[PDB]
Amino acid sequence: MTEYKLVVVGADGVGKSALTIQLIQNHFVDEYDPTIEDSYRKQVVIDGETCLLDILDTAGQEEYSAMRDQYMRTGEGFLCVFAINNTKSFEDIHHYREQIKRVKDSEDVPMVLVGNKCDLPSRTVDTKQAQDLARSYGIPFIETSAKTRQGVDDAFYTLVREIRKHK
Ligand SMILES: Nc1nc2c(ncn2[C@@H]2O[C@H](COP(=O)(O)OP(=O)(O)CP(=O)(O)O)[C@@H](O)[C@H]2O)c(=O)[nH]1
Ligand SMILES: [Mg+2]
């Protein structure tokens, strides 16, 4: 059975846990409970292949920033999440990407840029600007909503395809 080690990263509050819980449990968490580190092992069929997804839901709190090298070494693909209503979270993306590239000593690590909270009207990050950043990295970009489930399956399945396409 093919196993994929997915790691969800991004700033504190972007919706990493809500995205993961929506993918796995099909419901939206309204409450904000800061994550330390949670892991899920889930079986899914993607493109006719039975996949075992090992999903690591990480801490966005900068206080847990020394925990990152370990999961960056074991992780095969990274869901780099920002929120479309949080400009700082979009600027933090580059720091996450650089750190991943350094830990794995590679310019070609499977990644997907995710612009979450697309259900909200308070956008501060233009879709075109996010698309241009993803293009500069050579990675896919998808907008998602952990609330409506828009783009959620596509974001995780695209990351699996990036790990598989890189393999
Ligand atoms: N409207 C809307 N709210 C969202 C969405 N995703 C998450 N949220 C909300 O944002 C807040 C933080 O979500 P959460 O999933 O805990 O973010 P996180 O990135 O895991 C926080 P931490 O880094 O500390 O673990 C919660 O109030 C949650 O309901 C979304 O797509 N749309
Ligand atoms: Mg969380």
Amino acid at 66: A
Partnered with residue 55 across adjacent β-strands are 6, 40
Closest CA to 54 of 166, 163, 167: 163
Chain gaps in the chain, named by the residue before each (C–N > 2.5 Å): none
Ligand 1 binding pocket includes 58 (Cβ within 6 Å): no
The secondary structure element, H or E, covering residue 42 is strand 37-46
Pocket test for ligand 1, best of 7, 8, 9, 16 (most atoms within 8 A of CB): 16
Ligand 1 binding pocket includes 84 (Cβ within 6 Å): no
**What was the resolution (in A) of this experimentally determined structure?**
1.5
Closest CA to 114 of 27, 5, 16: 16
Q: What is the C-alpha to C-alpha distance for residues 56 and 156, in angstroms, rounded to an integer? A: 12
Give the distance (Å) from ligand 2 centre to CA of residue 48: 30
End-to-end CA distance of the chain: 15
Partnered with residue 40 across adjacent β-strands are 55
| Tokens describing residue 123 | 């956008």
Technique that determined the structure: X-ray
**CB neighbour class for 29 (10 Å; exposed up to 12, middle 13-18, buried from 19):** middle
Cα of 53 vs its chain's centroid, Å: 13
Domain annotation for the chain: domains and CATH numbers: 1-167 (3.40.50.300)
Closest CA to 58 of 46, 50, 70, 49: 70
Beta-carbon contacts of residue 98 (< 8 Å; ≥ 6 apart)? none
Q: What is the C-alpha to C-alpha distance for residues 9 and 40, in angstroms, rounded to an integer? A: 15
